[PDB]
Design a protein around this ligand. Sequence first.
Ligand code: NI
Length: 341
Amino acid sequence: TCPFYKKIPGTGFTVDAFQYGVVEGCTAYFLTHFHSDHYAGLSKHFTFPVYCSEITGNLLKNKLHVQEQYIHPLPLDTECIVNGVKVVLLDANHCPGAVMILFYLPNGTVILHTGDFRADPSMERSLLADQKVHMLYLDTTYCSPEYTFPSQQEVIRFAINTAFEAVTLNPHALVVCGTYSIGKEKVFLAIADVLGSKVGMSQEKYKTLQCLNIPEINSLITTDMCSSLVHLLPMMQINFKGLQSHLKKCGGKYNQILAFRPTGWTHSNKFTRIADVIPQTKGNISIYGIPYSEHSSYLEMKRFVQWLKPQKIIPTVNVGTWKSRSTMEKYFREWKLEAGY
Ligand code: NI
């Protein structure tokens, strides 16, 4: 049964609610992005209207085989009427195709559903500037002040410089980047660009990348692994055992691996500056954990919410424990007292 924080009152709409069977009264199912916790339940046998971005729609059709007749892509930054209700999709600054959804309810209430997002000051100059929001359904993944991490630009600068240094010292080193979902493509694309290489990968991952509308993509990726010195592997293989095994497969073309694990936040963020980050090393294999986040830091979230000044906040993440719910409620009241709304 569908939880309350996935329902939009005064409509027939749900958000990210595909794992509950046929939801009573739902005439349109919105999907914010193509991550498995959010699409859980969709398949080629789904027969209700799905509303989403173009990129999410490419992934539904090619990866999940949802039939074309049930896919309803909407352009971004454009007022659209769905089943008699005005909606707008906004870039969420999460993974490719990820959106926030603004709903203009028939009774005059305005609701913003962030989906998953990385708040940014650029959102203060979207179509959000123009009017008031009564209810905010908020991605509260990192809603506590201990969650700090650098800008995505600083993280990419560290990765490019690290990879370029290593491969210039040793032209026989291979770079490996972990992946388990869409998102964070800049990590492997920026490293391959500095090295003058295409990114090599499995046929399954090439297919997924071909759905993302990235400009000039045919110039940047390949399924010919042996022509490429940046390879992608599943995240589960980014360990000394799995990397040793991978090094065998390249027929003695390489004699060193340098590997990246983009994580979200880890507790080594609470002590170490990005500049000071060091790898784990065993022999000719080194592994870097890099804090590349596609969710808001505490401070980014706080800034967004203090600017938007919503009347009510409904968290969408960390809602399962009383301690989490209490902590999040305390910070919302601080933010409101400090800013005066
Ligand atoms: Ni996500």
